[PDB]
Design a protein around this ligand. Structure first.
Ligand SMILES: OC[C@H]1O[C@@H](O[C@H]2[C@H](O)[C@@H](O)[C@H](O[C@H]3[C@H](O)[C@@H](O)[C@H](O[C@H]4[C@H](O)[C@@H](O)[C@H](O)O[C@@H]4CO)O[C@@H]3CO)O[C@@H]2CO)[C@H](O)[C@@H](O)[C@@H]1O
Ligand SMILES: [Zn+2]
Length: 472
């Protein structure tokens, strides 16, 4: 049967199911309603940066249509919605003056969600640094971000936290560090060779450290000032793709473990254990910042739950660890990616070249965090796959591959939960086809189709799959 035995009965009592968007990717009204620009507005408006020179000026226009989109998610039997607040829609300059029209939007959205029985899970940040903060402070290169982010977070707690009980600070700080400061392909476009400046060997580590210190500072503010009255929770969202040793050789098994540590341990060891992974300390040395005892104690235990964005898996091949002139965060891992074993690909690709469909990676990741980190509370905060551009509406709606994707991946998550993993919830990326960063509107991740000419919504087969699976 097309549910493959899945239903709410197959998951723990009170397990949360939701869908996900992010502000810049869906809201639109990027330069209206008092919103100031983010680094993504500037980047997207530069010819050549985004597929087709597209941007998020209008996106899906959820700003005007949010009640339609909330009605739809409720009709599909989801319990929750993960979205983000645009920092520059609240503070157009990232600090100082509040945009009251921006505040009213998020109030109206949160209030409508609650009216319809949908739980808001709110990200404070999803790549969209106010452009004014980038220009004035140097963004995440500046330790002052901890203060700036904490004052922003404080405002959001004060204004929405009587209603919002489930917060996240950041989304995929690894991707910000990697693409913004190692490869220099997302804003601020920094890297060793880059026109904007940078250093691929040092800046990614500086950025990650500042995200960890800012997270900790915002959570300390929540706990000391807001928690007693509001009784909510604050976590963080981390990407984790699975790495499987290519063979059972000592060097391949080591390479796979190195990859895990440089990918997810980079953030989880500080958040769980109060220090960076030992291998990163050993290999990155002076280029890895050192937490003071006081900082490490602020960071450790600072996430009420760990959000994991889980998409894909790779095989890892090792090598003897070499003394190397430092070049980049990526090269520091000393591993070789491999995408076939025994002459067979690890899985077929979705539209995005990096996205290999490997449902057992979901089990790998969840089991791994269970066994390594003392079984912390984990929320699967994104999981999904994309269709290519230029299909007909009916081709988009017959998303048989995405249906198979969700059934397989959710079966593997169920496998890990049944083995004892402390997973509290699962969220599909995305509710709607949207602005997919460098891919623009050329990558379709939604369970709901969006016609980008007319802005009409049409639920795909995968939306109906969820509605059937999730009926109460
Ligand atoms: O895209 C959907 C959604 O997910 C969230 O972010 C995505 C990013 O949008 C996407 O760019 C990112 O891609 C990663 C990928 O996961 C890695 O596997 C891949 O690894 C590289 C490695 O860096 C190279 O050194 C090596 O040579 O090859 C491999 C490629 O096979 O690196 C890419 C970045 O290039 O994946 C994220 C999720 O993990 C966001 O939250 C959401 O907003 C996005 O829309
Ligand atoms: Zn509109």
């Amino acid at each position: 049967n097309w549910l493959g035995g899945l239903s709410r009965a197959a998951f723990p009592k009170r397990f949360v199911f939701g869908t996900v968007t992010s502000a810049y990717q869906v809201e639109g009204m990027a330069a209206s309603g008092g919103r100031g620009p983010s680094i993504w507005d500037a980047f997207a408006h530069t010819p050549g940066n985004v597929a087709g020179n597209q941007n998020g000026d209008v996106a899906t226009d959820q700003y005007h249509r949010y009640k339609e989109d909330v009605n739809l998610m409720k009709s599909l039997n989801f319990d929750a919605y993960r979205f983000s607040i645009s920092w520059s829609r609240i503070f157009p300059d990232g600090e100082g003056r509040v945009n009251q029209e921006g505040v009213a939007y998020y109030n109206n959205l949160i209030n409508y969600l609650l009216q319809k029985g949908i739980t808001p899970y709110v990200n404070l940040y999803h790549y969209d640094l106010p452009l004014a903060l980038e220009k004035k402070y140097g963004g995440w290169l500046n330790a002052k971000m901890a203060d700036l982010f904490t004052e922003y977070a404080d405002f959001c707690f004060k204004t929405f936290g009587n209603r919002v009980k489930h917060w996240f600070t950041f989304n995929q700080p690894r991707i910000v560090a990697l693409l913004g400061y190692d490869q220099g392909t997302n804003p601020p476009k920094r890297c060793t060779k880059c026109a904007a400046g940078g250093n691929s060997a040092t800046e990614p580590y500086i950025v990650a450290h500042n995200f960890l210190l800012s997270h900790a500072a915002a959570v300390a503010r929540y706990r000391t000032k807001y928690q007693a009255a509001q009784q909510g929770k604050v976590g963080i969202v981390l990407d984790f793709n699975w790495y499987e040793a290519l063979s059972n050789s000592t060097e391949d098994q080591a390479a796979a473990q190195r990859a895990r540590d440089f990918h997810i341990g980079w953030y989880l060891d500080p958040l769980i254990n109060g220090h960076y992974p030992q291998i990163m300390q050993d290999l990155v040395k002076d280029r890895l910042p050192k937490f003071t005892p006081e900082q490490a104690r602020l960071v450790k235990g600072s996430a009420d739950y760990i959000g994991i964005n889980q998409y894909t898996a790779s095989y890892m091949k090792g090598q003897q660890l070499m003394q190397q002139t430092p070049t980049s965060y990526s090269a520091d891992w000393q591993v070789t990616y491999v995408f076939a074993k025994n002459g067979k690909p690890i899985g077929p690709q979705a539209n995005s070249n990096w996205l290999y469909i490997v449902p057992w990676g979901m089990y790998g990741c969840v089991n791994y965090i269970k066994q390594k980190y003392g079984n912390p509370t984990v929320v699967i905060t994104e999981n999904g796959m994309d269709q290519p551009a230029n299909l007909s509406r009916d081709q988009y709606l017959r998303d048989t591959t995405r249906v198979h994707f969700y059934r397989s991946y959710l079966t593997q998550l169920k496998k890990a939960i049944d083995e004892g993993a402390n997973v509290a919830g699962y969220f599909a990326w995305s509710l709607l086809d949207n602005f997919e960063w460098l891919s623009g509107y050329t990558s379709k991740f939604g369970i709901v189709y969006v016609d980008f000419n007319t802005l009409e919504r049409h639920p795909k087969a995968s939306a109906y799959w969820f509605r059937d699976m999730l009926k109460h």
